[PDB]
Design a protein around this motif. Structure first.
Motif, PDB file in Angstrom:
ATOM      1  N   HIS A  67       0.856  -1.206   0.071  1.00  0.00           N
ATOM      2  CA  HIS A  67      -0.103  -0.071   0.019  1.00  0.00           C
ATOM      3  C   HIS A  67       0.881   1.118   0.055  1.00  0.00           C
ATOM      4  N   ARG A  68       2.131   1.037  -0.347  1.00  0.00           N
ATOM      5  CA  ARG A  68       2.941   2.280  -0.329  1.00  0.00           C
ATOM      6  C   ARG A  68       3.602   2.666  -1.798  1.00  0.00           C
ATOM      7  N   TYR A  69       3.940   3.600  -2.305  1.00  0.00           N
ATOM      8  CA  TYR A  69       5.011   4.023  -3.571  1.00  0.00           C
ATOM      9  C   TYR A  69       6.131   4.077  -2.985  1.00  0.00           C
TER      10      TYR A  69
ATOM     11  N   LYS B  67      -5.937   6.902  -4.373  1.00  0.00           N
ATOM     12  CA  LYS B  67      -4.513   6.571  -4.870  1.00  0.00           C
ATOM     13  C   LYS B  67      -3.724   7.673  -4.572  1.00  0.00           C
ATOM     14  N   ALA B  68      -4.338   8.830  -4.311  1.00  0.00           N
ATOM     15  CA  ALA B  68      -3.220   9.809  -3.762  1.00  0.00           C
ATOM     16  C   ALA B  68      -2.455   9.480  -2.515  1.00  0.00           C
ATOM     17  N   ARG B  73       2.751   6.183   1.718  1.00  0.00           N
ATOM     18  CA  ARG B  73       1.416   5.464   1.639  1.00  0.00           C
ATOM     19  C   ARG B  73       0.632   6.076   0.609  1.00  0.00           C
ATOM     20  N   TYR B  74      -0.163   5.150  -0.240  1.00  0.00           N
ATOM     21  CA  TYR B  74      -1.286   5.660  -1.085  1.00  0.00           C
ATOM     22  C   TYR B  74      -2.499   5.226  -0.240  1.00  0.00           C
ATOM     23  N   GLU B  76      -6.597   4.561  -0.408  1.00  0.00           N
ATOM     24  CA  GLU B  76      -7.755   4.320  -1.183  1.00  0.00           C
ATOM     25  C   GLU B  76      -9.083   4.962  -0.740  1.00  0.00           C
TER      26      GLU B  76
END
Lengths: 84, 90
Positions: A67-69, B67-68, B73-74, B76
């Motif tokens: 859940h990370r970029y 997804k910002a 972290r993004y 949802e």
């Protein structure tokens, strides 16, 4: 010897998970080429086999891991040595 | 009342940090419209939140933040029904 630096890894990141994130990159000596920076800071230095592997690792900049970029940078040998 | 659901927050996230992530969304009653979900297993926050928003256009704007990023972290962003929000906070 060629290095990339990953930033933004989860607290839980393992060498296996990083190797899989980098699946399409030829990582030198596999898992043994992955060096997690500890204080576990979210950074890793990864030795890769060739220039084209640096370029391919860099294509994964801001790709998702869980859940990370994950940010992907080049790194110099001096940077990788100093960090470990 | 209209709700959205955020997933993937830092489990330590504050109401203020969530309000700032949602800065361009009209959140009902500001920080009081943000409801952090707590695990029924270990009692700690899960990284999910239900947020009451003022209008349909606010649902749409919150959904644009899907997804910002928040740090690395993004986040949802989903719509949520009142029943879903009530059940998560029961």
């Amino acid at each position: 010897p060629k290095f990339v630096r990953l930033r933004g890894l989860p607290w839980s990141a393992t060498h296996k998970e990083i190797l899989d994130f980098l699946e399409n990159v030829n990582v030198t000596n596999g898992s043994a080429g992955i060096h997690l920076v500890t204080s576990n800071t979210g950074e890793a230095y990864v030795e890769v086999a060739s220039q084209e592997d640096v370029e391919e690792a860099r294509k994964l900049n801001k790709a998702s891991m869980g859940h990370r970029y994950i940010e992907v940078f080049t790194a110099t040998p001096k940077e990788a040595k100093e960090a470990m």
